[PDB]
Amino acid sequence: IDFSKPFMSLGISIMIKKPQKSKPGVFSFLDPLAYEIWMCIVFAYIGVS
Amino acid sequence: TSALSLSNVAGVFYILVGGLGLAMLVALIEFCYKSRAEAKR
Ligand SMILES: *C(=O)CCCCCCCCCCCCCCC
């Protein structure tokens, strides 16, 4: 087929959603410290005892 | 601001083990001393 010169420009692009977040967890009180700092506060407590 | 990592505190846990190790030494040295000196009587 034939085409005119372009009337609008574009390029392929990516659309993503915006996870609203705002959804805390039940045990979200453990986030400050990483998981390994709790697996080792529990191994130090058995040790020191 | 992510969760605090083990490396960040990996040092406290050493002083703990080291202290626990020193503790057992201090105890068994007294024991050793108190042991022989008793048999020697
Ligand atoms: C009498 O004098 C005998 C004393 C024996 C002492 C043995 C060593 C004490 C405990 C050391 C524990 C080290 C734990 C960490 C290893 C990596």
UniProtKB/Swiss-Prot annotation, chain A:
It is found in: Cell membrane; Postsynaptic cell membrane; Cell projection, Dendrite. The chain crosses the membrane at residues 35-49. Detected in cerebellum. Palmitoylated. Depalmitoylated upon L-glutamate stimulation. Ionotropic glutamate receptor that functions as a ligand-gated cation channel, gated by L-glutamate and glutamatergic agonists such as alpha-amino-3-hydroxy-5-methyl-4-isoxazolepropionic acid (AMPA), quisqualic acid, and kainic acid. L-glutamate acts as an excitatory neurotransmitter at many synapses in the central nervous system and plays an important role in fast excitatory synaptic transmission. Belongs to the glutamate-gated ion channel (TC 1.A.10.1) family. GRIA4 subfamily. Homotetramer or heterotetramer of pore-forming glutamate receptor subunits. Tetramers may be formed by the dimerization of dimers. Interacts with EPB41L1 via its C-terminus. Isoform 3 interacts with PICK1. Found in a complex with GRIA1, GRIA2, GRIA3, CNIH2, CNIH3, CACNG2, CACNG3, CACNG4, CACNG5, CACNG7 and CACNG8. Interacts with CACNG5 and PRKCG. Found in a complex with GRIA1, GRIA2, GRIA3, DLG4, CACNG8 and CNIH2. The postsynaptic actions of L-glutamate are mediated by a variety of receptors that are named according to their selective agonists. This receptor binds AMPA (quisqualate) > L-glutamate > kainate. The M4 transmembrane segment mediates tetramerization and is required for cell surface expression. This is Glutamate receptor 4. It comes from Rattus norvegicus. The chain holds residues 511 to 559 of 902 of the full protein.
UniProtKB/Swiss-Prot annotation, chain B:
Detected in cerebellum. The chain crosses the membrane at residues 9-29. The postsynaptic actions of L-glutamate are mediated by a variety of receptors that are named according to their selective agonists. This receptor binds AMPA (quisqualate) > L-glutamate > kainate. This is Glutamate receptor 4. The chain holds residues 806 to 846 of 902 of the full protein. The gene is Gria4. The M4 transmembrane segment mediates tetramerization and is required for cell surface expression. Homotetramer or heterotetramer of pore-forming glutamate receptor subunits. Tetramers may be formed by the dimerization of dimers. Interacts with EPB41L1 via its C-terminus. Isoform 3 interacts with PICK1. Found in a complex with GRIA1, GRIA2, GRIA3, CNIH2, CNIH3, CACNG2, CACNG3, CACNG4, CACNG5, CACNG7 and CACNG8. Interacts with CACNG5 and PRKCG. Found in a complex with GRIA1, GRIA2, GRIA3, DLG4, CACNG8 and CNIH2. Palmitoylated. Depalmitoylated upon L-glutamate stimulation. In contrast, Cys-32 palmitoylation does not affect cell surface expression but regulates stimulation-dependent endocytosis. Ionotropic glutamate receptor that functions as a ligand-gated cation channel, gated by L-glutamate and glutamatergic agonists such as alpha-amino-3-hydroxy-5-methyl-4-isoxazolepropionic acid (AMPA), quisqualic acid, and kainic acid. L-glutamate acts as an excitatory neurotransmitter at many synapses in the central nervous system and plays an important role in fast excitatory synaptic transmission. It is found in: Cell membrane; Postsynaptic cell membrane; Cell projection, Dendrite. A lipid is attached at residue 32 (S-palmitoyl cysteine). Belongs to the glutamate-gated ion channel (TC 1.A.10.1) family. GRIA4 subfamily.
